[PDB]
Every structure is written in structure tokens, then in C-alpha cells.
Write a protein that holds these residues in place. Structure first.
Motif, PDB file in Angstrom:
ATOM      1  N   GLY A  78       0.824  -1.207   0.000  1.00 41.03           N
ATOM      2  CA  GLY A  78       0.000   0.000   0.000  1.00 41.03           C
ATOM      3  C   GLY A  78       0.855   1.253   0.000  1.00 41.03           C
ATOM      4  N   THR A  79       0.239   2.389   0.302  1.00 35.68           N
ATOM      5  CA  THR A  79       0.914   3.681   0.180  1.00 35.68           C
ATOM      6  C   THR A  79       0.743   4.454   1.476  1.00 35.68           C
TER       7      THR A  79
ATOM      8  N   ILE B 230      -4.278  -9.343   3.388  1.00 31.56           N
ATOM      9  CA  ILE B 230      -3.530  -8.144   3.036  1.00 31.56           C
ATOM     10  C   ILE B 230      -3.560  -7.936   1.528  1.00 31.56           C
ATOM     11  N   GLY B 231      -4.173  -6.830   1.107  1.00 33.95           N
ATOM     12  CA  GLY B 231      -4.285  -6.495  -0.308  1.00 33.95           C
ATOM     13  C   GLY B 231      -5.450  -5.566  -0.612  1.00 33.95           C
TER      14      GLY B 231
ATOM     15  N   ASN C  74      -5.515  -0.477  -0.227  1.00 34.19           N
ATOM     16  CA  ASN C  74      -6.137   0.696  -0.857  1.00 34.19           C
ATOM     17  C   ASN C  74      -6.281   1.857   0.121  1.00 34.19           C
ATOM     18  N   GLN C  75      -6.397   1.544   1.410  1.00 31.69           N
ATOM     19  CA  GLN C  75      -6.531   2.562   2.459  1.00 31.69           C
ATOM     20  C   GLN C  75      -5.276   2.699   3.328  1.00 31.69           C
ATOM     21  N   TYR C  76      -4.579   1.587   3.530  1.00 37.63           N
ATOM     22  CA  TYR C  76      -3.528   1.516   4.530  1.00 37.63           C
ATOM     23  C   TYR C  76      -2.156   1.234   3.965  1.00 37.63           C
ATOM     24  N   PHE C  77      -1.157   1.562   4.773  1.00 32.79           N
ATOM     25  CA  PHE C  77       0.227   1.247   4.494  1.00 32.79           C
ATOM     26  C   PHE C  77       0.569   0.095   5.434  1.00 32.79           C
ATOM     27  N   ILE C  78       0.703  -1.098   4.871  1.00 36.60           N
ATOM     28  CA  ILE C  78       0.897  -2.311   5.673  1.00 36.60           C
ATOM     29  C   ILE C  78       2.374  -2.655   5.751  1.00 36.60           C
ATOM     30  N   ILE C  79       2.874  -2.883   6.967  1.00 37.61           N
ATOM     31  CA  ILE C  79       4.279  -3.251   7.169  1.00 37.61           C
ATOM     32  C   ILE C  79       4.400  -4.620   7.841  1.00 37.61           C
TER      33      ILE C  79
END
Lengths: 362, 362
Positions: free
Chosen positions: A35-36, A75-76, A84-89
């Protein structure tokens, strides 16, 4: 639905002083992101992995990959951890064997893997290292920290180690401390490695204790069956014939449990990570209440009906202490048919409770 | 107090047809007796042993012995199984390795131990064999059948296999069926033996899988600590230093857990006996009620607060089904500080509940 092709990234920091006095210099943290990240730096979610897991929580490394990341159904784009909403780490724990500082790290003198020279690490250390990574990515306060089993223990540690650095905490199929039973399974695994002829005080390199580690890991495959599915396998009667006749005698290979020599794990790392899990204790009752009183975030605790490794009672003790501490906490016991790793499998009711928790801040 | 010097005796019978179709011919049953059998043949108690145990439940074999029998604090003049009043019997299970028909029995063709050629045995078979022994000693109806853990599973089998051949049944720290957790510990042990280089399809003789069996048995030593005593050992922090520095690296020997190579067990036998335990199921709920409706004897069920191997919940399921079947049943949960083998240790409150049960027929 699929996040696609992902590169593993490596964040390196000058040092990390560990809780036991030892120092990692440098510290490397292998991680992947999905994500971004917002310009406000406030939509970030840290995924913490379990014992078998790693930084590769979603997507693929190449077109030829045969399986996606370990939590890819969650996750996706459009999925529960919505990229699409979150930045996943997600990052590999220090002490791990898939890119972060661990026993396979090359020693600055011998130019061989550290092996048994690597310092003992704790869950508090693993979380300190994740804090470094998160800061480096420009994040001061995570939206969420999530994980199951071993990953939920890191997520719990976060909620009290850096209580103001996360808004939410998802603790799935987990515990504030390992039972004697959990420690016993790990101890047997560790002893299998220690007694393997190739162990060489942990300074193996040419020839690893493959047999010992196969045994150590088989534990996770055998424990995967629920009480009902294990009884179904075993029935009410032993086999016909004898050990030779049933070909029960030719069962050596079954130690790998269908898994190959290529999906690679490390014996030292198994010892390091399981020791961190076994030695972590926030306690129970009044002591756990006191330990968790630092937390400020909102909590989601999810247990699984058939999970006997990290059973609903361990989750209940957390929720009980989180209520005794006057904290925001929701508790869902999901129906399941597996022995422990049900949090990994796509499940409509899991998807729903996750999406709704992240969507509704109450 | 002490019954003194005891000889192991050997009862041999022409054959025993096993439940899986195989035949033991001849059948040998190693046993020991304590006390004196009444001319009315009606004061006899059968003791059934647990996984580590054998026929030597009390007294000594020679003056130089360093430990008495495995239940010596409970069997003798004045003790809970009073050899002043009762005729106490204990026998090694078939499939065992301490005198009864098992894998160490010499093969009539090769004049080597049967090994993996020995047939799979069940708990129902073990009890059929005990019936033969008891009949041979002149006994039609036993006063009591008692045992803990594995021994309680034999005792349960007796109560329904030969319901009119016993007046009383003592089931301590036991279960009507193994959980996935119990089966998993045994499966890991069995795989440790199977993957040992000396296993040789079970036809080892010169060089046994000592390492594999050491691992298999270590499980019973590691699981001995309660949740509290295991947490006390592990604390809230991992060790200082590294695997090499803490001498954690030189831990191979710890597989034997203080125990020597002389107190001898057999790898095949471990496989045979644990397979019998794992494959035995009377079920639970309605199915267990139905299975136990055959019983006519009086029941004493004793569980232990800290026992997590055979936890109070397994005993409760038995007592629940024994009440649903309208049977005479008493249930006591004793306070304990051990991980499973608390039924073995001298305990005033255990002594009292046993002596009173045997003394008062109501």
C-alpha cells in the motif's frame, strides 16, 4: 485482490542495545510494505509474524512463486488489511532467519554465520527493533499493530512498550505468557537440535542439524490437528499387523511432514526465537493487570474454538486484565476446525470482525 | 511399612488372540504380588501401571536396590493398598519391556528380539491378558482395579470389558481418550525413534536408537513441571550472552535428564505402548455414556489441580458420563504441585480418600 510482486527491503541501523546487555552492531531489519503511506503518516499498520512466518506476509517475489505471502488472504486491495486505504508493514524478527539480524548473519571476524555466537533476544528486543524500523519509515504513531500466536505476543508488547505509538492492537490466538505445555513442545524441539550429531555447539556451517530441526518443526505440523480431527485420524483401534507390516517401520521421512529441504529454516534461529517466546511473561491476574495498565490503545482479542495450542482461556486472561485495567477491549471467540493456525485461513467472520474494527474507532 | 524383598513372577499361557487378528503364542505376563490371597479369593486388588511403570509396584528386588517399587508409598503393611488386608497384584502390560510378551521377546525363528515384528496391541488386549493372569491366580472377581494415567485407562477398560469381574474401580489422573495434545507428545517421541540412525526398521539389536528414545522419554521429564513451576524456571527474561557463552551449546547430554543408561527402556516398546494409548477411545458425551453403561462396579475418580497432561476436565467427562449412566461414582480433585505424576507421590489426602473408599462400600 492480489498486491502482486513485492521486494524484500533491508533497513540497517548502527546498533541495538539488547535487554540482556549484548549489542547488535549493526542491526538489520528485513521488511516488506504493502500500500501507500499517507503524507500525514497516519494510516500505517504493523503486521507481526508467527513462528513459521517472516516479512513476506503478502504477494509474490516472482512470477514462478507457488504460494503468496503468509497472510495474503488478509492483506491487499479490498482485503481486511486494505492496501487501498492503509500502508501495511511486516518485518522479520531479530533472531529470525529470513533477513533480519540473526544467527545466519555473517560474523565480522570469521566471515561465517554467527550461529551460536548471536546474542539471546527477547520479545521486548524484537519490538525495540520494530520501533527503529517504523521511525525510519517516517512513522511516529501506527494506526494498528496486528498478529497471531507469536505475532500477537509482539503486538501485546507494543501496546505497553510504546503505548502512545499505536492507536489499535489486534491480538489473535495468543497469550501474555506461555503455558508449561507450550514451553514443553519448544523444549523438545530445542533438545532435538542440541542432540543432533551435526549441531557442533551451534557452529555448524557445511552440515546443519537438518534432522534435529525437522523434528523441532514437525511439532508444528503434528499439533495442527484439532482434538476431533486427531481422534478421527486415530479412531478407537490401533493398526493391524506389526511395525514392519504396516510400513510403519519406514517412517523416517515423515519427520519433514511433506515439506522440502528448500523452504529453509535454521536450527539456531529456532532456538533463539522459541527461547524469546518461552521467556516472555506479562503474567496473569493482578500482575497482568498491572503490566497492561500502561496501554492506551484500543484492543481486539480474537481466539479460536478448536485452537488448543493458544486456547481461548489464554485470550480470556488478557481480556479480563484489560477490563480490570479500564481499557478499550473487544473479545471474539471464532469457531474453528484447526489445532492452532486458524488465524491464517480465509474466514468470512474473521474478515468481518477485522474490517469493522479498523473502520469503526469506537 | 515396607513389604520387603519381592520376586518378579512369570505366568505363561498358550495363546492370546489380539483384537487386530494377530496371535501371541505363547503369552507371558510378568507380575508381582503383595500380601496374602484369602481362601475366599475375594480380597484381591489389581494395580495397573503407567507409561514409565512396570510390575514392580512395591518393595525391593535386592538389598542393594536404591529405590523401592513405583507405588511403594501406597502398597504395603498399613499403607493405602494394605497388604495386611489385601492381595495386591501388578503386571507389566503386553507390548511392555519389563517381562511380559513384547518386542524384546525372543523370536522362535531368529532367536533375536521380535522388535518391529511384534504385533500392535491395544488397551483392550492388555486387559484381556490381565484377565488371564487373574483367573490363573484363582480369582473370579477382584475387589479393586486401580491405576493412574495410562494405568487408569486400563482400569476403565476393565470396568466395561469384564464388568462383573470387579467390585471397585479407581481411575486416577486419567481419561477415556487422549487429547490431540497427548497424542502430539507421543507422536513426536515416536518420530524421534523412527528418525534415529540406529532404528533399522525396528530390527536393531547390537545398537539401539538410544538417542531417539532418550528424546521420546525426555518428554515425560519436561512435562513434569506445573504451569507455575515452569514459569518460575523461565521467568520474564531470556539468558545473558549467547548459546555458546551460557554453555547452552553443550546441552546434548540433557536429553537423558539425569537418568542413566542402566535403567533400561526399549524404543519399539515405547512405540507399541504409546500407540495403544493414543488409539484407545471410549469417546465423550453421549458416546462415552453409552460405552460406560456396561459397568456395574463402584467408581473412584481422582484428578490433580496442577496436572495439565491429564487435566481435571478429562476426569470430569468420565464422572459426567458415569452419572448419566446411573453408576456409583465419587469424584475428588486433589490439590497438587506437579505436571502429571502427582498420583505417585505420598500425600495425606490421597492416602485418606483411598483407605476410606476401600474401607466403606457405600
Amino acid at each position: 485482490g492480489s498486491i502482486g510482486i513485492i521486494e524484500t527491503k533491508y533497513a540497517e541501523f548502527k546498533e541495538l542495545i539488547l535487554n540482556n546487555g549484548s549489542v547488535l552492531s549493526p542491526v538489520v531489519i528485513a521488511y516488506e510494505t504493502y500500500g501507500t503511506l499517507s503524507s500525514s503518516k497516519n494510516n500505517a499498520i504493523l503486521i507481526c509474524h508467527a513462528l513459521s512466518g517472516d516479512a513476506h506476509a503478502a504477494g509474490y517475489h516472482s512470477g514462478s512463486d507457488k504460494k503468496p505471502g503468509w497472510w495474503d488472504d488478509y492483506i491487499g486491495p479490498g482485503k481486511s488489511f486494505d492496501t487501498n486505504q492503509y500502508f501495511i508493514i511486516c518485518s522479520n524478527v531479530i533472531g529470525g532467519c529470513k533477513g533480519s539480524s540473526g544467527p545466519l548473519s555473517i560474523h565480522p571476524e570469521t566471515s561465517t554465520p554467527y550461529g551460536s555466537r548471536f546474542p539471546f533476544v527477547s520479545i521486548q528486543d524484537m519490538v525495540k527493533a520494530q520501533k527503529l524500523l517504523v521511525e525510519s519509515l517516517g512513522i511516529e504513531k501506527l494506526f494498528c499493530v496486528a498478529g497471531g500466536s507469536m505475532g500477537g505476543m509482539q503486538a501485546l508488547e507494543w501496546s505497553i512498550a510504546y503505548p502512545n505509538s499505536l492507536s489499535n492492537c489486534i491480538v489473535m490466538a495468543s497469550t501474555a505468557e506461555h503455558s508449561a505445555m507450550q514451553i514443553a513442545f519448544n523444549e523438545v524441539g530445542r533438545q532435538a537440535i542440541l542432540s543432533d550429531p551435526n549441531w557442533k555447539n551451534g557452529l555448524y556451517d557445511e552440515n546443519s542439524p537438518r534432522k534435529g530441526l525437522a523434528l523441532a518443526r514437525m511439532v508444528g505440523h503434528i499439533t495442527y490437528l484439532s482434538d476431533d480431527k486427531m481422534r478421527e485420524k486415530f479412531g478407537r483401534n490401533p493398526p493391524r499387523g506389526n511395525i514392519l507390516s504396516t510400513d510403519f517401520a519406514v517412517g523416517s521421512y515423515l519427520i519433514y511432514q511433506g515439506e522440502s529441504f528448500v523452504d529453509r529454516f535454521d536450527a539456531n534461529s529456532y532456538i533463539y526465537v522459541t527461547k524469546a517466546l518461552d521467556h516472555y511473561s506479562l503474567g496473569k491476574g493482578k500482575e497482568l493487570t498491572a503490566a497492561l495498565s500502561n496501554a492506551t490503545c484500543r484492543f481486539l482479542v480474537v481466539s479460536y474454538s478448536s485452537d488448543w495450542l493458544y486456547p481461548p482461556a489464554q485470550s480470556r486472561e488478557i481480556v479480563k486484565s484489560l477490563e480490570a485495567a479500564d481499557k478499550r477491549v473487544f473479545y471474539v471467540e471464532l469457531q474453528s476446525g484447526e489445532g492452532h493456525d486458524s488465524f491464517l485461513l480465509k474466514n468470512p467472520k474473521q474478515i468481518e470482525i477485522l474490517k469493522g474494527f479498523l473502520e469503526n474507532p469506537n
